[PDB]
Design a protein around this ligand. Structure first.
Ligand SMILES: Nc1nc2c(ncn2[C@H]2C[C@H](O)[C@@H](COP(=O)(O)OP(=O)(O)OP(=O)(O)O)O2)c(=O)[nH]1
Ligand SMILES: Nc1nc2c(ncn2[C@H]2C[C@H](O)[C@@H](COP(=O)(O)OP(=O)(O)OP(=O)(O)O)O2)c(=O)[nH]1
Ligand SMILES: Nc1nc2c(ncn2[C@H]2C[C@H](O)[C@@H](COP(=O)(O)OP(=O)(O)OP(=O)(O)O)O2)c(=O)[nH]1
Ligand SMILES: Nc1nc2c(ncn2[C@H]2C[C@H](O)[C@@H](COP(=O)(O)OP(=O)(O)OP(=O)(O)O)O2)c(=O)[nH]1
Ligand SMILES: Nc1nc2c(ncn2[C@H]2C[C@H](O)[C@@H](COP(=O)(O)OP(=O)(O)OP(=O)(O)O)O2)c(=O)[nH]1
Ligand SMILES: Nc1nc2c(ncn2[C@H]2C[C@H](O)[C@@H](COP(=O)(O)OP(=O)(O)OP(=O)(O)O)O2)c(=O)[nH]1
Ligand SMILES: Nc1nc2c(ncn2[C@H]2C[C@H](O)[C@@H](COP(=O)(O)OP(=O)(O)OP(=O)(O)O)O2)c(=O)[nH]1
Ligand SMILES: Nc1nc2c(ncn2[C@H]2C[C@H](O)[C@@H](COP(=O)(O)OP(=O)(O)OP(=O)(O)O)O2)c(=O)[nH]1
Ligand SMILES: Nc1nc2c(ncn2[C@H]2C[C@H](O)[C@@H](COP(=O)(O)OP(=O)(O)OP(=O)(O)O)O2)c(=O)[nH]1
Ligand SMILES: Nc1nc2c(ncn2[C@H]2C[C@H](O)[C@@H](COP(=O)(O)OP(=O)(O)OP(=O)(O)O)O2)c(=O)[nH]1
Ligand SMILES: Nc1nc2c(ncn2[C@H]2C[C@H](O)[C@@H](COP(=O)(O)OP(=O)(O)OP(=O)(O)O)O2)c(=O)[nH]1
Ligand SMILES: Nc1nc2c(ncn2[C@H]2C[C@H](O)[C@@H](COP(=O)(O)OP(=O)(O)OP(=O)(O)O)O2)c(=O)[nH]1
Ligand SMILES: [Mg+2]
Ligand SMILES: [Mg+2]
Lengths: 453, 453, 387, 381
């Protein structure tokens, strides 16, 4: 039987009986304890939402777009079984996030295991594989019309990727642009967190996903089939990446929200050698090794935070000290923000040297602000059709749309912090950063003249 | 200085430096890990908000109402010291909640320690005393112009409640703001109306900004009260009608309440085997952690995941229940009915359903749906002024308002669940329930004619 | 081809090319000049929305409910042209409204010509009949697959075995646009959400949830639109919403008195205001649908801007409105706030089903749901105003 | 006594009794029959709102901002006399809008009278003069604490423009509330961002309440904001440049405006409006006499319809519109080719009195390179 879910973002959403079987498992319900925005909840009190409700919304929107394409284009021969496999990927595309979401795979793991190749996409299919086997859903998928081996491949291909695709013929290549669009990034995962993060933080979203769906249409281009949209909508697609970039500077890359994220990783790193997570077959794992056993990664949620804080173990005292610094709001003071050049951008291989560089002129964080396609324009990977010939998809260049569009599509930001809260330190630390920007020929800080003339 | 918090409900809300230092403590930040709606999150996935964000809203609304009374009528001589003490009562009104909020003081504590009378108001004031002492704010309150002796009584009286000694009877109206014991119209209700509806996806039929625009203090019976105008008695009836919809739609959802029941069941079977530490290092159980604040500070929803991830063979009976929740193998709801059943009789109804599948196979949940004051109309304890003489507080009775208002103001619902889930057990459980309704002469189940012909 | 319309209430709605042709006629486009709430705009400044956009939503919701029923239940033989006809009636349910809506058919005509019995429903079928004939569109309806003689009668029957539009096997399609049996129809769901959003008030009925659980059931050998056991408390709240909108906005004592002053201004201006090939007055424009087309809220400002001394008494009263010299609230106004069916309970006309057998309709009584529900369901109010 | 008005945008707003007396006049209530977005209503159904509702919001926000600065900076000597004059200027900066707002003074009047020089501010000050004299409010303005000679001049200067004769340069920051000429950050923009989006069904991307919480006056004197809000200030001009692209310059919406100019230009010969002493004015001439301009609303559109010009309106009601006439549209941040943030000063949390200049390079590189552009549309009649 179909179940219904009331959602503040999408309203009542219908779930296939198989979708419910995937939801009501420990590997999915785990997501109720991973916060979407990690440390951003300690700056925006409304961002209490977790990965679980986000996953439901991505599965709903995937089903919405995949159904509009089949209803408007029966030529595509999209089957109910394709739609279902599309909805499973949208639900399971978030399975592989770790504690506090982008803090785990973007800070902690890069610091604890510098040479491991790890992303949440990889974790999502590793966890999805453990979800199906550990709950006996192979038979369940057969009962609802799915052919597992091919479809298990197809689902995992939407989440991560690799005509290199084994799960679906190239004649249905457009199904891979719904859940996780590797070609341009216009996927159902962005549309849900645009609306769900703005709802919870209390900021404004400037992209209407429903209007986009009404004009979505598969077109052939360069002998392959892509998802295209109308030419009259090219302006709002630019505004979708302007929405996403505006969402990052306000909330995701909030300097206080990020310094709280760095403090949690540093506490996690200091608690790493002493926290024991029981994995598969009784084996024990650290925080940085739980990603190797899915049975242990299941039990690696935000509970680690309170486990460290509510602890009595003397070995956890140093990690507990950093969390106590957070609950008392004694945080590292933000001293300034600057920008390098495109050609003078700092490489990740040099990140470990900069606090030494500013002291000779400390916490330095480097954030890269791009439209998704590194320094490339994502819209140039989008094709557009006219109302007189819906099968001819043309290229709309940036100069054809507007002269007010961004000159560049990627940039880098350098935030500097100081661990000493002394008024004399915060003054002296600000003096180093201002001279550090003049020496390295970086851009002038906004508060530069008042704190240091 | 002052800080500004962005809130999805109230927007940018400014907080006095003393309020900032009150919330930046482990006993306040503890509220970030208490689900506002408890088990409702497992039915309404948008209900992930915690007590922390609710506390700031109540304190901000407390400040809006007392700031309007002060500005409109200088006659009352409301001081900044008074307005600060009201906001402090708004923030700390929720400090006394336990894991999953109303589950703790309404289900677990009654069954774990039936001898002791415990409320979250008693908890909030006890937690408030521990908050100011552990963080040494008695000197900070003195710094911002407060008199700790008298004001801490005043802060505590607003929470718990001429019996008061923290304020003279001339300021009696300041006790109707944070926790109105007289009629229930308080700023704590306005925030959870708007905040819960935002997250649940439910509609709210009450406007507090309009009420505040007409709030005015008048004398009657030589005592001063907060009153609103003639024209607002209709909106005041809907405020308690809204509260009843939020209780019927969400807070007393049949599936959300059974999930709360199972978390209590799991808690009571885990209560003897888990230790919480605090005050002078003594160990405390879940049920006895209310006797000490240093232990109760570390008693949050984290208890759920510690039981679920536990390795102890002494915790399987409790871990078994929580995994029935994770896989959603819940007790099946059999039916709803209506009669008054004394709380002392609650324990006896399970054996009564079986007499019409042993007694333990049933669970009977009695809910008292009222308007806040048992069977009394709260509007009868509200005074109204008119535009001609704004200083005379008249009385509007239910007949003068409307004839479509409720007849009574208190009813009880009874829900029957069965711990057996097979098709044969559910059938017999449905038959017992319908017969049990005749044996005691209850209201006819809605589906009885279809389920038990 | 299909056009999409961005509406602030329903978002982007798609309209079949036939419905676009009906929209683009003078008889539908004139509804851009009929205030939905009439005299409420002079008390709630947000309610500037007209009848035009209200109609686009009643027919959008009409398509939504009819299409959900055919997809869940192909056993009903709901054709794609059944759904076009249900949509048409939703759009044209509002064609027969006069200047300022409830000001016209609710007060003005009852005093101007007490002999006639005039309703906006009876105005809709005549304006619709004029609409199809004056634009030569019985041509286009057969082009998109409809049989006019039966389908047109079907459309009008929904506005106003008795029916001849369709047989008792399709008896549930008459419960969508104008539900005469309990009042649960798409018309209410739109102005609930549309008036609330413009007035600044709060709606408390979720219509998208009611659609998710709607299902037809054979009751008394007749097919009826039903809902689930669990949605009965939300039905009581639906009429409770409708009542709040009347007590807060629709029957606001200052908003009603402004409507009454516009009636008095139209009454005194009635014999001297001529609308054209005969000539018609405001009171007789209802008798010629070619005149009712040119009879909108513009009739208000044509009196206010005139200079003929014959209309001075009428203009002196619209001069009293623009300077807010209104009748002091102490003209006697009687208001009957019911549940849409006189003193009856509409829930006693609603059937429900269970999960166990989703084909067994059953009646749920008030004593079964909640004991805190109203005692009565109709109620009268008396107000007097000093001229 | 005070009156409260419930609003879909701002909620319950309180209005001084002197404000109510300005509202309850024929020259202000006229704005109930001037739709704010003109022809965008025939493309966006939800956009049925008029200038009247907008005018109440402009004055309410003009009152929020000035009252905010009163209570945080008493060193500015802001009086209840200044706050009243700002709110009046907020209410009356839209009095001089003709039928369908910008279709009248953007297309029709420049085409009907190429020699004339007409703007809606000129009308706003002229009809504000016509409002207080026709309704005898000069004795009521003085009764509520104002000095009518000096304050009127201040009210008409917040609308049009040390060259000011209503307030001294020691209070120059109050001309930056209603109609900012230095950079364009005024409460009028903030009201139509939220009120047009609400009705069009478009999304907004500027938080006006957050901007008010960080407003300070800094040394002349200009209104400044925190350094952390410069990014929100470009997105303010980006929000509204995005508002012009979707609704204000909608191709089918703009072509409807042009067809109503043509229908008005053809009906200008025979359009009769009675004016000052019974003298008849045309549509194109009712601006020279505020008695006639008072009665010049959207009513003329339906007056032509119910009467050669009736053919064009008939072509619009039947959607026989021109297919996608050459219209030129100027898209700018409000200051021609200039950059409005260069005329904005900022203060830090360190020295709140030291105003600083922030350049585009210090904010972000993903910002526009130019700040003006022009689009050319062609249509077939
Ligand atoms: N908007 C709204 N949502 C509701 C309401 N009542 C319950 N819900 C929400 C909670 C769930 O996420 C979702 C489904 O809950 P339901 O009560 O309709 O289904 P439930 O499984 O509890 O009962 P059932 O299996 O159908 O017998 O809708 C309501 O009255 N309004
Ligand atoms: N202090 C504090 N801020 C919170 C909280 N929840 C959300 N927020 C917001 C308000 C702050 O403006 C914002 C930034 O946090 P802080 O101001 O405490 O850190 P910041 O680096 O700005 O140092 P500061 O204290 O302003 O000198 O976090 C909370 O619980 N405590
Ligand atoms: N607090 C915080 N959140 C981030 C950060 N980076 C990404 N996110 C948050 C914002 C969204 O809610 C969500 C989007 O990231 P996801 O992991 O869900 O998907 P994905 O990486 O594909 O995002 P993308 O396609 O690049 O926009 O995570 C960050 O650096 N800090
Ligand atoms: N609506 C909105 N909220 C923001 C924005 N930026 C930050 N916030 C939210 C997060 C906080 O809860 C609150 C305060 O953040 P702020 O950045 O303004 O204060 P913060 O202490 O971090 O900086 P400061 O110490 O004052 O220099 O507002 C924004 O651009 N728009
Ligand atoms: N099954 C399920 N429902 C959820 C979940 N989150 C929110 N909801 C909502 C949808 C459901 O209609 C509603 C009630 O949950 P259930 O239907 O599973 O409880 P119920 O005793 O009615 O089981 P049943 O419908 O007889 O299978 O909660 C979830 O994670 N799993
Ligand atoms: N899930 C759930 N939430 C409840 C229940 N009872 C109360 N609440 C929730 C709804 C509100 O968000 C919030 C209000 O309860 P509080 O204890 O915080 O305030 P209070 O004691 O004053 O209740 P009152 O104002 O009299 O309704 O807790 C319940 O039985 N189940
Ligand atoms: N939400 C939203 N609505 C828009 C936008 N642009 C126009 N509209 C609204 C106005 C209409 O009610 C509806 C249709 O607008 P369109 O420009 O897409 O239709 P149009 O017939 O003018 O273009 P077409 O004939 O298909 O080339 O959507 C937009 O950017 N966002
Ligand atoms: N006076 C006036 N009220 C308006 C207007 N627009 C919306 N409203 C609302 C605010 C008022 O509280 C409400 C009632 O109108 P009035 O107060 O003017 O009439 P009322 O019978 O209450 O006479 P009153 O002056 O209060 O003794 O209309 C307007 O333009 N002028
Ligand atoms: N200002 C005002 N509006 C009214 C009044 N009575 C009805 N309406 C308005 C409010 C709604 O927007 C709308 C609803 O009634 P309709 O004219 O659309 O038709 P109908 O009689 O079928 O509605 P109903 O079934 O009675 O709820 O008309 C009234 O007495 N005064
Ligand atoms: N949000 C909301 N607005 C209302 C309500 N009732 C009336 N209004 C709106 C209409 C007006 O624009 C505004 C104030 O009008 P009121 O009806 O409260 O006062 P009114 O002048 O008519 O009576 P009064 O002169 O004070 O005796 O609020 C309500 O229940 N909720
Ligand atoms: N339908 C339509 N509206 C326009 C057009 N140009 C401007 N507007 C409308 C959009 C806004 O609601 C409103 C904004 O302009 P205002 O008349 O309120 O004043 P102003 O010229 O100072 O606007 P600004 O400060 O430059 O943004 O006028 C247009 O070309 N077509
Ligand atoms: N045709 C029409 N469009 C409306 C109406 N109300 C709002 N809109 C919107 C939907 C349209 O996509 C948009 C543009 O209008 P049209 O499509 O009719 O003119 P257009 O030049 O695009 O010619 P077209 O038929 O699309 O080739 O106006 C209406 O009543 N009729
Ligand atoms: Mg009806
Ligand atoms: Mg301007």
């Amino acid at each position: 039987t179909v179940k219904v879910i009331n959602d503040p973002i999408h309203g009542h959403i219908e779930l296939h009986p198989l979708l419910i079987r995937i939801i009501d498992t420990p590997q999915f319900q785990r997501l109720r304890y991973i916060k979407q925005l990690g440390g951003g909840y300690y700056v925006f009190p409304g961002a209490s939402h977790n990965r679980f409700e986000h996953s439901l919304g991505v599965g709903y929107l995937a089903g919405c777009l995949v159904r509009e394409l089949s209803e408007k284009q029966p030529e595509l021969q999209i089957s109910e079984r394709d739609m279902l496999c599309v909805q499973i990927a949208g639900l399971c595309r978030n399975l592989g996030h770790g504690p506090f979401s982008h803090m785990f795979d973007g800070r902690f793991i890069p610091l604890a295991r510098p040479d491991v190749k790890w992303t949440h996409e990889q974790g999502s299919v590793n966890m999805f594989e453990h979800l199906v086997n550990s709950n006996g859903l192979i038979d369940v998928m057969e009962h609802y019309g799915l052919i597992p081996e091919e479809d298990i491949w197809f689902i995992k291909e939407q989440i991560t990727g690799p005509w290199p695709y084994k799960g679906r013929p190239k004649e249905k290549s457009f199904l891979y642009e719904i859940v996780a669009n590797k070609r341009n990034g216009i996927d159902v995962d962005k549309w849900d967190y645009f609306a769900r993060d703005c709802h919870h933080l209390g900021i404004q979203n400037n992209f209407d996903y429903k209007r986009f769906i009404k004009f979505a249409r598969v077109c052939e281009v360069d002998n392959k089939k892509h998802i295209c949209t109308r030419e009259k909508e090219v302006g709002n697609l630019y505004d979708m990446f302007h929405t996403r970039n505006c969402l990052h500077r306000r909330a995701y890359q909030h300097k206080v929200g990020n310094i709280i994220d760095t403090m949690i990783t540093d506490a996690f790193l200091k608690a790493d050698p002493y926290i024991e997570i029981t994995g598969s077959e009784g084996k024990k794992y650290r925080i940085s090794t739980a990603i190797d056993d899915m049975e242990a990664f299941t039990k690696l949620t935000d509970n680690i935070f309170l486990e460290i804080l509510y602890s009595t173990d003397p070995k956890l005292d140093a990690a507990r000290a950093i969390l106590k610094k957070i609950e008392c709001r004694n945080l590292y003071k933000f001293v300034g923000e600057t920008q390098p050049g495109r050609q003078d951008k700092i490489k990740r291989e040099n990140y470990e040297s900069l606090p030494k560089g500013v002291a000779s002129a400390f916490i330095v964080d480097v954030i890269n602000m791009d439209y998704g396609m590194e320094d490339k324009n994502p819209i140039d990977n989008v094709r557009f059709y006219c109302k007189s010939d819906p099968n001819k998809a043309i290229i709309i260049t940036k100069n054809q749309v507007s002269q007010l569009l961004p000159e560049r599509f990627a940039e880098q930001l350098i935030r500097v912090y100081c661990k000493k809260t002394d008024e004399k330190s915060l003054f002296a630390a600000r003096q180093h950063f201002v001279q550090w920007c003049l020496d390295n020929d970086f851009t002038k800080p906004q508060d530069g003249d008042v704190v240091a003339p």
